[PDB]
Enzyme design. Structure first.
Site, short mmCIF file in Angstrom:
data_model
loop_
_atom_site.label_atom_id
_atom_site.label_comp_id
_atom_site.label_asym_id
_atom_site.label_seq_id
_atom_site.Cartn_x
_atom_site.Cartn_y
_atom_site.Cartn_z
N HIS A 143 -36.76 58.28 -55.21
CA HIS A 143 -36.22 57.79 -56.46
C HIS A 143 -35.87 58.85 -57.50
O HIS A 143 -36.52 59.92 -57.62
CB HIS A 143 -37.17 56.75 -57.08
N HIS A 176 -32.52 55.62 -49.15
CA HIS A 176 -33.92 55.74 -48.58
C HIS A 176 -33.93 55.90 -47.05
O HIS A 176 -34.71 56.71 -46.53
CB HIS A 176 -34.83 54.54 -48.90
N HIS A 230 -28.26 52.07 -52.40
CA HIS A 230 -29.60 52.61 -52.73
C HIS A 230 -30.56 52.60 -51.52
O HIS A 230 -31.20 53.61 -51.25
CB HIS A 230 -30.19 51.81 -53.89
N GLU A 231 -30.68 51.47 -50.83
CA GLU A 231 -31.61 51.35 -49.67
C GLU A 231 -31.20 52.34 -48.59
O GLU A 231 -32.05 52.99 -48.01
CB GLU A 231 -31.64 49.95 -49.06
ZN LIG Z 1 -35.71 52.35 -54.00
#
Ligand SMILES: [Zn+2]
Ligand SMILES: [Ca+2]
Ligand SMILES: [Ca+2]
Ligand SMILES: [Ca+2]
Ligand SMILES: [Zn+2]
Length: 158
Positions: A123, A117, A113-114
């Site tokens: 999101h 980003h 997930h990170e």
């Molecule tokens: Zn996040």
């Protein structure tokens, strides 16, 4: 939003959590980059000195960016979108207990997930998506990116 404008991206593990074996941190982070390399034209390499694009940091409380961690629970990790310096960098809250398994907080699932980003993704509203804002444990063996994640990273790269 901003994206990396090159195909070879380096990362560097600035320090390792004492929660896990060194090699399990290497392997979790590696596998997480692999998830995104599988669906883009990006190649990721781990470097050991010098400046990397994506610095991976384990830190607690106030750690010099303007985004303090909050002790155990709450915020697990955060990462900055593509850009110079702190851009791209992924920070993991040391006050969590990082693991390879279902106990504490899974490093691998979190780093996928990170890294999304670090690559420029925001999101997703889809609870099936790895970019969904809330951490949900799933078998690290059963793990797949959702149609939504793939669609999101392909709108950015490839
Ligand atoms: Zn996040
Ligand atoms: Ca950086
Ligand atoms: Ca926390
Ligand atoms: Ca810890
Ligand atoms: Zn930070």
């Amino acid at each position: 939003g901003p994206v990396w404008r090159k195909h070879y991206i380096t990362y560097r593990i600035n320090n390792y959590t004492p929660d896990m074996n060194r090699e399990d941190v290497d392997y979790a982070i590696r596998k997480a980059f692999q998830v995104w390399s599988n669906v883009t034209p990006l190649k990721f390499s781990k470097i050991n000195t010098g400046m990397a694009d994506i610095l991976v940091v384990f830190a607690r409380g106030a750690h010099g960016d303007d985004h303090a961690f909050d002790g155990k629970g709450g915020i697990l990790a955060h990462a900055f979108g593509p850009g110079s310096g702190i851009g791209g960098d992924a920070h993991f809250d040391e006050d969590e207990f990082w693991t390879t398994h279902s106990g504490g907080t899974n490093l691998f699932l979190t780093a996928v997930h990170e890294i999304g980003h670090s690559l420029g993704l925001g999101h997703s509203s889809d609870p099936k998506a790895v970019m969904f804002p809330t951490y949900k444990y799933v078998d690290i063996n059963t793990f797949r990116l959702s149609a939504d994640d793939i669609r999101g990273i392909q709108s950015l790269y490839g």
